[PDB]
């Protein structure tokens, strides 16, 4: 029932009729519509007219929510999204002062701080627009007011928690706002409201703990302004947070939120939390399970049965790896990584909270393998993972087999440390980790052939991590590796002879010859695979 044709129009009045009749659910389609729709729907004139109408309707708002205003503000911030990401769209200079007028009218309405889920739905779009439109400098007092007014009754409503949590995005987005950064150093009331909000113990273990954690995080960010008049209050607030909550335990999301941003701009000794990561690693990964003399597990909260299933599957994968890769069990030169440490958090949330501090890693992924330096006697490589309900039984450790194969590949196939290759090896490393662990069980790899968008071997081999194209890296890396093992296993060993000796130019010439010689066969092979 959402027809985007109605937005492809030149009359402001029909546009708003489309907004009000089709509603927020259909306006939502403007974020992903073709540029033809977006250029028509998001002209400077349309945006000025919608903003002025929204302004008058918001002035008349009498509480209880508004499907029309929710849709209007969504359209307005949808426009800033399209203008940012569509080069065919650039707003004239009078567009934003009007959008600010439309926002101001909702903010100055006597019902702005109303409670309730219906009000939260329009309020959410208004608070997001403040960020989308680059208006963070204009609503600092709104942040302070919501932080000061928040209570348990606002906290009853899912849509109020979601809406008001947007005030923290405003502080985050203001970093790129020159007006904001000239003003923020004076906002002592906001700093006081932020620390009071995060130090409220009733938020711990509650549905608003995540807002208190975001409060702490945004306060830690203000540690940047070392010479600003807010700096004593910021320091005092961070010090209070670090003293009231544990780095592991109830409320540690608030502790770790503050530590994350504050450690980026202030020394640990400023808050006397130097070396907290050692104690945290021991609290968070408190279990020890010894699989063998070459694999040990440190984990947050696995059962003995899970520990046993992980050790057994890794012993199984090891054997299958060496047979399949024909290693002779002989590692590459200059590699002393006989022992491995496996680190398993209780959930992706736990991984997201603790692994960054403990291991220094990015956690926007499904796990991580850290080979270290194999030439250093005493180096212990680590992989870091989390339990997931959708992981493999019986261990339910997400990417257990995948990361383990990274260790095996790194020790038996790929000379040097992780950064050593001078030619791209992403397709191989990720493809062999997927193929050795999944073999022929990869529905998503079949599906990405069936959808009609494909890659050539040459494109697969030139895959990088840039933009983390999971489809290209993991599915098409898997497909090329599986194809070469099934159809040209002698060529695979020839390639491995180059990689095992760190002969990267020779490796690249080998696989570029494949990309010329085998492309038609690969094309027929993927076709047969997609058929059945």
């Amino acid at each position: 029932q959402c027809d985007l044709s109605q937005f492809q129009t030149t009359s402001s009045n029909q546009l708003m009729a489309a907004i009000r009749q089709q509603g927020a659910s259909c306006v939502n389609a403007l974020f992903s519509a073709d540029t033809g729709v977006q250029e028509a729907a998001f002209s400077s004139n349309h945006m000025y007219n919608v903003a002025q109408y929204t302004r008058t309707l918001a002035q008349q708002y009498a509480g209880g929510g508004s499907d029309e205003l929710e849709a209007l503000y969504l359209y307005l911030r949808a426009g800033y999204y399209a203008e940012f990401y569509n080069s065919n769209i650039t707003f004239l200079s009078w567009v934003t002062p009007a959008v600010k007028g439309a926002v101001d009218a909702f903010v100055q309405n006597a019902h702005f701080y109303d409670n309730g889920d219906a009000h939260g739905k329009v309020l959410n779009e208004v608070i997001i627009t403040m960020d989308s439109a680059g208006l963070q400098h204009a609503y600092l007092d709104v942040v302070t007011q919501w932080l000061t007014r928040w209570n348990a009754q606002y906290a009853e409503h899912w849509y109020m928690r979601n809406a008001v949590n947007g005030v923290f995005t405003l502080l985050f987005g203001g970093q790129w706002n020159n007006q904001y950064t000239s003003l923020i150093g004076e906002q002592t009331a906001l700093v006081t409201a932020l620390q009071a909000f995060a130090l409220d113990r009733t938020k711990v273990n509650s549905p608003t703990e995540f807002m208190a954690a975001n409060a702490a995080r945004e306060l830690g960010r203000l540690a940047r302004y070392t010479d600003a008049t807010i700096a004593p209050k910021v320091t005092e607030g961070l010090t209070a947070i670090f003293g009231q909550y544990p780095s592991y335990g109830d409320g540690d999301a608030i502790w770790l939120g503050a530590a994350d941003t504050a450690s980026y701009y202030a020394d640990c000794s400023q808050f006397n939390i130097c070396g907290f990561e050692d104690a945290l690693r021991d609290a968070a990964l408190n279990q020890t399970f010894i699989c063998s003399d070459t694999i040990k597990i440190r984990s947050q909260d696995m059962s003995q049965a899970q520990h046993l299933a992980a050790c057994d599957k890794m012993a199984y994968e090891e054997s299958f790896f060496h047979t399949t890769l024909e290693t002779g069990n002989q590692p590459v030169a200059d590699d002393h990584n006989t022992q491995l440490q496996v680190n398993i958090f209780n959930s992706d949330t736990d991984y997201g909270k603790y692994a960054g501090p403990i291991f220094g890693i990015d956690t926007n992924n499904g796990g991580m393998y850290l080979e270290g330096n194999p030439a250093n006697v005493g180096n212990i490589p680590n992989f870091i993972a989390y339990e997931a309900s959708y992981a493999n039984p019986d261990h339910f450790v997400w990417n257990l087999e995948h990361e383990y194969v990274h260790y095996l590949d790194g020790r038996f196939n790929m000379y040097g440390d992780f950064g050593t290759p001078t030619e791209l090896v992403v397709w191989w490393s990720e493809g062999v980790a997927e193929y050795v662990s999944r073999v022929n069980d990869n529905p998503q790899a079949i599906a990405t052939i069936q959808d009609g968008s494909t890659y050539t071997l040459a494109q697969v081999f030139d895959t990088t991590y840039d933009g983390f194209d999971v489809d290209r890296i993991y599915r098409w890396g898997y497909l090329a590796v599986r194809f070469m093992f099934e159809r040209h296993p002698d060529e695979v060993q020839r390639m491995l002879s180059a990689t095992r000796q760190g002969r990267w130019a020779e490796y690249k010439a080998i696989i570029s010859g494949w990309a010329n010689q085998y492309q038609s066969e690969f094309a027929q092979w993927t076709e047969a695979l997609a058929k059945g």
């Binding site: 939502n28 974020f31 992903s32 969504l74 911030r77 949808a78 800033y80 999204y81 940012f84 990401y85 959410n124 779009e125 997001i128 960020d131 989308s132 995005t169």
Partner: peptide
């Protein structure tokens, strides 16, 4: 970049 859809 600006916030995406809800």
């Amino acid at each position: 970049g600006p916030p995406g859809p809800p």
